[PDB]
Amino acid sequence: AYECGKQGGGALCPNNKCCSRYGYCGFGPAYCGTGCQSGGCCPGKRCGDQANGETCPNNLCCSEDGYCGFGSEYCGAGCQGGPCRADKLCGQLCPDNLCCSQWGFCGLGVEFCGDGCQSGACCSMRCGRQADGAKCTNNYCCGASGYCGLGGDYCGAGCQSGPCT
Amino acid sequence: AYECGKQGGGALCPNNKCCSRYGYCGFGPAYCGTGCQSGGCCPGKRCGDQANGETCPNNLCCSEDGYCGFGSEYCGAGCQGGPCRADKLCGQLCPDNLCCSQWGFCGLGVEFCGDGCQSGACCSMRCGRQADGAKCTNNYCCGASGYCGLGGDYCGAGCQSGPCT
Numbered sequence: 001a002y003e004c005g006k007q008g009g010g011a012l013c014p015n016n017k018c019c020s021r022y023g024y025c026g027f028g029p030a031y032c033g034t035g036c037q038s039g040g041c042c043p044g045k046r047c048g049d050q051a052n053g054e055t056c057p058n059n060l061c062c063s064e065d066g067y068c069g070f071g072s073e074y075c076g077a078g079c080q081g082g083p084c085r086a087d088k089l090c091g092q093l094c095p096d097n098l099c100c101s102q103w104g105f106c107g108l109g110v111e112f113c114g115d116g117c118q119s120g121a122c123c124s125m126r127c128g129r130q131a132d133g134a135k136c137t138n139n140y141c142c143g144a145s146g147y148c149g150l151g152g153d154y155c156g157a158g159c160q161s162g163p164c165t
Numbered sequence: 166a167y168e169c170g171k172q173g174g175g176a177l178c179p180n181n182k183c184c185s186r187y188g189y190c191g192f193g194p195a196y197c198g199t200g201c202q203s204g205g206c207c208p209g210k211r212c213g214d215q216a217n218g219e220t221c222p223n224n225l226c227c228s229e230d231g232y233c234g235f236g237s238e239y240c241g242a243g244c245q246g247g248p249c250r251a252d253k254l255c256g257q258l259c260p261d262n263l264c265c266s267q268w269g270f271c272g273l274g275v276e277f278c279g280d281g282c283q284s285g286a287c288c289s290m291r292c293g294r295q296a297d298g299a300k301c302t303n304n305y306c307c308g309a310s311g312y313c314g315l316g317g318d319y320c321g322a323g324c325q326s327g328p329c330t
Contacts, residue, residue: 003176011168012177014222016262016273016286017315026316027262027286028308032278040262042288044274057179059224059235060273061248069274070224070248070263083226083235085250097181097192097205098235107236108181108225109209113197121181121192123207140192149193150182 005037012058016040044068048080055081055095090119093138097121122148128160136162170202177223181205209233213245220246220261255283258303262286287313293325301327 002008007023017025021035032042038057047056050066060068064078075085081095087105088094094106101107102116113123119137127136130146140148144158155164167173172188182190186200197207203222212221215231225233229243240250246260252270253259259271266272267281278288284302292301295311305313309323320329 003174008176009168010179011173012179012223014175014177016224018286020316020318024316026314026318027305028312028314028316028319029289030308030318031314031316032286032288040264040273040278040286042273042275042278042286058177059181059248063274067274069272069277071266071270071272071274071277072252073276074272074274075248075250083224083240083248085240087237099205101236105236107234107239108205108207109228109232109234109236109239110207111238112234112236113205113207121183121197121205121207123197124194143193143195147193149191149196151185151189151191151193151196153185153191153195154193 013039016058041068044074059083059096094120097138139163169204178204181223206233209239224248224261259285262303304328 002023003025004011004013004019005023013019013025016039018031018039019037020031044067046066047054047062047068048066056062056068060082061074061079062081063074090100090106091104094100097120098106099112099120100118101112125148126146127134127142127148128146136142136148140150141155141162142160143154167188168190169176169178169184170188178184178190181204183197183204184202185196209232211231212227212233213231221227221233225247226239226244227246228239255265255271256269259265262285263271264277264285265283266277290313291311292299292307292313293311301307301313305315306320306327307325308319
């Protein structure tokens with residue numbers, strides 16, 4: 001029955017719905033208030049230096065004061081995680097599986113994850129006996145056919161390296 | 166069994182993991198490639214004026230070209246959705262259940278969703294008998310105790326107004 005959070009295998013709700021303390025999605029005090037696991041919690045979940053380096057779920061911004069939300073108070077000056085308005089440098093893996101572009105910036109989409117992607121959720125990174133025994137970054141699995149990724153297709157049968165099985 | 170997407174009741178994967186065409190979370194082409202439902206798809210899902218107004222899952226930014234991603238190419242100049250670097254005004258709902266603050270800006274966290282929140286995922290907007298018959302915004306449900314929200318706690322038993330079941 002559970003939809004989200006610890007009870008639902010770490011799933012997130014869609015469209016910023018709060019995951020209640022019991023593992024169901026919705027809005028209002030029962031979901032977003034005390035015990036809120038993810039989504040648009042009110043107040044925002046603690047993050048960053050104020051929570052042992054935890055990032056915000058759902059790609060929220062971590063404010064200077066270590067709360068998760070959106071808007072200039074969260075993503076602007078002093079933003080310490082998520083989609084901050086400042087460019088995010090990398091070389092230092094990107095947080096939350098963001099791609100480190102050829103040019104050393106974090107993001108998602110082909111400009112970041114496509115050709116020249118260094119790390120994170122790259123589109124097509126080669127590994128294993130297909131790529132000279134090359135290793136995957138981010139502790140991803142090398143798949144049977146020599147692509148880096150995660151999930152059963154890469155970590156399951158024929159997995160060459162990384163956290164197989 | 167299913168984790169995400171249509172098969173997983175619309176749930177999102179954590180940490181920008183891609184939801185495969187079969188409703189499982191991971192990275193690499195099997196998950197992020199053709200049929201990718203959410204997460205860090207590559208290429209990014211179509212969005213905005215290139216997808217009938219649809220917004221990016223997981224609060225990704227919609228680029229001016231109508232692709233979902235993060236970084237300056239997506240969130241910066243020309244961004245048409247998600248956590249764009251530009252402030253977003255409201256008064257005119259906010260997209261993706263973002264709160265419209267009393268000052269008419271979209272975001273999440275207490276500065277937006279707390280005192281004076283006009284619409285979206287407000288922390289504690291009163292409604293129903295307890296608020297002299299006041300209505301909820303966003304087609305939310307008014308719960309039995311007179312708070313606006315969504316999910317079984319508000320739309321279920323005791324629901325006063327909005328799309329009760």
